[PDB]
Subunit: 306 residues, 3 copies
């Protein structure tokens, strides 16, 4: 079992400084030793340096850094594609969530029937025509879903992307801050999600059971787990740019990761939005990074029973 | 849909200074904007000034401020009755829980077939003959329930009350600190409650389903939600006078409020016992007020899925 | 109902200073008054003074303080045995968990059909041949189970010990940090456990139901509850030597204790591993002790509904 680790210090999908230091923070929290201990053979690609784009002006006076985000993702997709082609399960450390455009695109090149489990407080499914922030980290799913493409304009730097997956191939877990146009999109395209309210009702065991029935109930598929640290309650993961009260507990997050491992199908994992500079103390930053490491290790087989 | 907001700075139902500043704290936490955003047409009645009573001596060398609490409640009931009669769902900000004598009396004055959901760590059902504290905020339910009246003596300032509400028409959620005579009362009059232990067993979904089956399972009735902030765990709502460990989680509180909204029958709401002065820090005070706003907004339709 | 309280300031089953002050901390937190209030008739044995053993050198160059732990446990066993035969339910305050060798041995002397509910983040079932720490507090169960005796070497000071429990007569609740050879032992000997993951799946109600079906489903038996404070999440019980993230909530711990009380069969209880010196503040120490008192009081009938 081989795992590739790619640092992707994306910050230009959003406006808050510091998220580019997430990969270093997660490595410093002992990621590689934890993975080695489980028996993973590792290839560390280090932290990538992405090519900047000069004069990357706003698109439509709103969308920030489109060419930079587009090119960084094109470059990242090439690395992810190569790693998956070489037989590695691919762990990408962020960095802001716009990097999922690149990781999912790269992953889908060799694994076109992948499915996506998107664990997040947010749906990240605004389009360039619905976003009220202009921040691409709150739009990445819109660029990836085939059914949405007539509603998504062509951004500069984005021409290389071709939507990778169907709306029936993504399931959200943890949602508790969704913009009204995103709610419209989720309902209109029948995209399945388990919000925090659904977890309150069903419990995390049934949520995972139903997630897998929707995605792999009738056929095996490589799983892409895109995990935004802000899915966790801010008491547990304070070092992040968009915290929302009332999130996953520690135990719920471990359970999600355990079930992902138990499928035997995990093929790529993103761990995004750790921003150590937003912690009010070193302890806050380190606990957030420690939590990120626990998620990744659990996703690759660390158990709570020995 | 129209909502009236009434500030009721009651503090004489108990002995701790500061709870009279609860209404201002909740307002400063953004209550009105949150309600407007949901589509509520608002009538703000401001913070009421209640008429004092001279020489309001203890009743029976025990019960504190009886005439002051009686008259403040009589005055409050007049405002609540007018608001409800004019078509508003009536939100009353406390202030200590003795104010529910006035809000429920005033609500019932217009809506005699109302039912009550009482969310609290405490049953608040001592009578003047069973209370060990003498504090009227731990007695309001005894003045309101028809079946209990042959056991409730007449307090000065209390003669105006017309307690018609049946013991079958109140359900408690959250109970974890109940005095022995209150336990006797709950059992003897077959009053239904879901204690924290019941929530541990059933889960909040089934608790809400069972609550509504009891109250509105046979017929539609206006709902009065009387919500003591101390229902929440003290880690979440520290700025309150009688905290008890082991309370509702944030998610459970939001779920209760969401289910109240989903009935379409919410007619009045009390949010009581926020005391900003009992916070150890500005942060503790503000988080308690923010939580109060979240409960109110969720009760009028704020969702966690957009 | 009569309850003996025994202080057992064991520290030599592990290496961290301070756990010998656990019994005093629990008493200072109001244990005796809480038990009296429930109607318990009390015999306080005080804190026992155990006979030291000079030159208690490492066994096999690894196992720490074997003669001291063995002798202290032999002495403790005599006290517990006498107390149980005099008709007391026996509460032993720790002290490190190696004391359970003594309490369970003493208990079983007059109650051979006892069963054991072991509430803990850890399985405490290493043998002298599997331990990697050498600390006897992580081994007590191996000395007590009949089925394991061909794999447990004779330690100096341990000759008085006869295993008196079958592997089918112990159930674990709370497990989340289990060493690989302990996992092998649990599986190989079909020892039943409900890990944190099992609690996440089933809920604490179902966990207790299944626990009692396994132990007393066919006949009434005296129950020995051995409760390591580290079963609780470290946010709730920080003052302990081996904290592990993702533990029982306050409510889950109360529910466990309530269900133990509800059986009517509680015969002895250990409350171990409170180490006030490991608190980083007096508040942390006090909350851990207060929690210990809550567990013991709930196990003897304190309710959350009055
Ligand atoms: N929907 C947001 C989401 C930002 C978080 C992105 B993720 O999950 O990668 O971290 C936020 C929109 N905003 C919410 C608050 C009110 C105004 C709109 C957006 O910017 O589009
Ligand atoms: N039962 C109490 C309740 C006080 C809280 C009122 B609420 O819910 O509005 O905030 C307290 C009685 N007291 C409990 C602790 C032990 C002594 C008696 C009382 O004073 O009657
Ligand atoms: N399994 C441990 C358990 C110690 C806790 C004892 B109890 O529950 O009474 O508090 C720990 C072994 N250690 C765990 C971390 C990795 C190395 C081995 C041991 O020392 O045997
Ligand atoms: Mn997010
Ligand atoms: Mn995201
Ligand atoms: Mn209360
Ligand atoms: Mn109350
Ligand atoms: Mn332990
Ligand atoms: Mn232990």
């Amino acid at each position: 079992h081989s795992v590739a680790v790619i640092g992707a210090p994306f910050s230009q999908g959003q406006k808050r400084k510091g998220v580019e230091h997430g990969p270093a923070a997660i490595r410093e929290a002992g990621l590689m030793k934890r993975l080695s201990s489980l028996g993973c053979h590792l290839k560390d690609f280090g932290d990538l340096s992405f090519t900047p784009v000069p004069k990357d002006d706003l698109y439509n006076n709103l969308i920030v850094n489109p060419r930079s985000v587009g090119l960084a993702n094109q470059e990242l997709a090439e690395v992810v594609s190569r790693a998956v082609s070489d037989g590695y399960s691919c762990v990408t450390l962020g960095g802001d969530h716009s990097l999922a455009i690149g990781t999912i695109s790269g992953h889908a090149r060799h694994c076109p029937d992948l499915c996506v489990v998107w664990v997040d407080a947010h749906a990240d499914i605004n389009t360039p025509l619905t976003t009220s922030s202009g921040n691409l980290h709150g739009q990445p799913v819109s660029f990836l879903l085939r059914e949405l493409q007539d509603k998504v304009p062509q951004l500069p730097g984005f021409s290389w992307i071709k939507p990778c997956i169907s709306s029936a191939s993504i399931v959200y877990i943890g949602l508790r801050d969704v913009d009204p146009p995103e709610h419209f999109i989720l309902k209109n395209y029948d995209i399945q999600y388990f919000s925090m309210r659904d977890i309150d009702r069903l419990g995390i065991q049934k949520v995972m059971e139903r997630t897998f029935d929707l995605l792999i109930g009738k056929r095996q598929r490589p799983i892409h787990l895109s995990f935004d640290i802000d899915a966790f309650d801010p008491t547990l993961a304070p070092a992040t740019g968009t915290p929302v009260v009332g999130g996953l507990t520690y135990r719920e997050g471990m359970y999600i990761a355990e079930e992902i491992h138990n499928t035997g199908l995990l093929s790529a994992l993103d761990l995004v939005e750790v921003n150590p500079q937003l912690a009010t103390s070193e302890e806050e930053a380190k606990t957030t990074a420690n939590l990120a490491v626990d998620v990744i290790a659990s996703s690759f087989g660390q158990t709570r029973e020995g």
